[PDB]
Amino acid sequence: TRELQSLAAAVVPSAQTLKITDFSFSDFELSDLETALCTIRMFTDLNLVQNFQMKHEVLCRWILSVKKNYRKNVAYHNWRHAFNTAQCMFAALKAGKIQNKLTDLEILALLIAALSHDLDHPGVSNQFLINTNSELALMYNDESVLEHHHFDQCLMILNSPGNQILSGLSIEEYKTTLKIIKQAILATDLALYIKRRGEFFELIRKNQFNLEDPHEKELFLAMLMTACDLSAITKPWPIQQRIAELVATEFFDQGDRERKELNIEPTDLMNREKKNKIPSMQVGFIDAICLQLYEALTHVSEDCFPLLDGCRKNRQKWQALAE
Ligand SMILES: CCCCn1ccc(=O)c2c(N)nc(-c3ccccc3)cc21
Ligand SMILES: [Mg+2]
Ligand SMILES: [Zn+2]
Numbered sequence: 181t182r183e184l185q186s187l188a189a190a191v192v193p194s195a196q197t198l199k200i201t202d203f204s205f206s207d208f209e210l211s212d213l214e215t216a217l218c219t220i221r222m223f224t225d226l227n228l229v230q231n232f233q234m235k236h237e238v239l240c241r242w243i244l245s246v247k248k249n250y251r252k253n254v255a256y257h258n259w260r261h262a263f264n265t266a267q268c269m270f271a272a273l274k275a276g277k278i279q280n281k282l283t284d285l286e287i288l289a290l291l292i293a294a295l296s297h298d299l300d301h302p303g304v305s306n307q308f309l310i311n312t313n314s315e316l317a318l319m320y321n322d323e324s325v326l327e328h329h330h331f332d333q334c335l336m337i338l339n340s341p342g343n344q345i346l347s348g349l350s351i352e353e354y355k356t357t358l359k360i361i362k363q364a365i366l367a368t369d370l371a372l373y374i375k376r377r378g379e380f381f382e383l384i385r386k387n388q389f390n391l392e393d394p395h396e397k398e399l400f401l402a403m404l405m406t407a408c409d410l411s412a413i414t415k416p417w418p419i420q421q422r423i424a425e426l427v428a429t430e431f432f433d434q435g436d437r438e439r440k441e442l443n444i445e446p447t448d449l450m451n452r453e454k455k456n457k458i459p460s461m462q463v464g465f466i467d468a469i470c471l472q473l474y475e476a477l478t479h480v481s482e483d484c485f486p487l488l489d490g491c492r493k494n495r496q497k498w499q500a501l502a503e
Contacts, residue, residue, distance in 0.1 A: 203271050250300070272404065
């Protein structure tokens with residue numbers, strides 16, 4: 181217990197005080213307790229607590245359970261990444277003006293999904309799990325293996341005694357919400373983003389994009405999840421550079437495991453010996469994966485431009501190092 185008593189007892193500072201509406205937000209200076217308070221504030225200011233009759237103590241317990249079920253020693257995919265993903269979601273809904281485009285249930289699902297989307301991440305990739313004969317890969321037939329696991333864990337915590345923040349929902353609202361959560365968490369598989377984004381970009385290019393179409397709505401929610409998942413790439417250079425080091429640390433750690441467990445030379449991305457490739461890889465990733473997404477999101481809501489602006493600024497910085 182102990183953290184629950186401290187967390188539950190605390191007066192939760194305002195969103196303005198906590199700076200969580202800012203796209204350029206940094207978690208680095210905050211304690212674990214402070215990030216927990218921020219998370220309560222996100223639920224509160226998105227009209228989720230009273231709307232769905234969440235008990236304060238239960239919400240606090242759930243937040244702590246989510247935090248606890250990240251592996252703190254995994255360099256990047258730990259609680260702070262999940263927290264930052266949820267913070268970007270909050271900022272996008274608020275400053276980015278996405279909130280009024282979505283239903284209450286969608287907002288509820290997205291915030292829960294953001295916080296839960298990498299739960300119990302082992303610090304290695306889907307490909308690694310497949311290649312090391314993971315029981316998870318077998319269970320999920322090699323498809324979005326990690327993300328199926330994150331969803332499993334999400335459900336487990338939601339059903340845990342004392343943590344049931346969705347216990348107040350009606351049977352139909354509960355069904356709807358769980359389905360959105362599943363899709364949102366699965367969407368964070370970059371493989372699924374690459375597979376599905378073409379449709380999204382095409383719809384926008386052809387002036388066919390329609391949020392009132394159920395399929396296009398869920399496509400948009402998947403893209404929004406990815407935008408938040410990759411949010412560190414949009415941050416002020418010092419914040420982005422620090423987080424980029426964590427990403428590389430984790431990838432190189434996998435490479436070490438690959439050499440030992442698979443007797444293979446890792447790809448550049450996973451090869452510490454070839455760490456000189458980082459700036460060029462960062463530029464390539466921003467071009468291939470990031471820019472089009474933040475451009476598209478800004479098309480949907482102009483107020484999301486700061487994410488695009490930040491991404492472009494980071495591209496310039498990396499390219500200066502690379503060339
Ligand atoms: C060392 C990274 C090289 C570039 N890179 C290659 C392939 C990837 O799959 C990824 C990735 N998933 N994320 C990032 C990243 C995200 C936020 C902030 C900083 C970086 C980078 C990346
Ligand atoms: Mg993930
Ligand atoms: Zn993630």
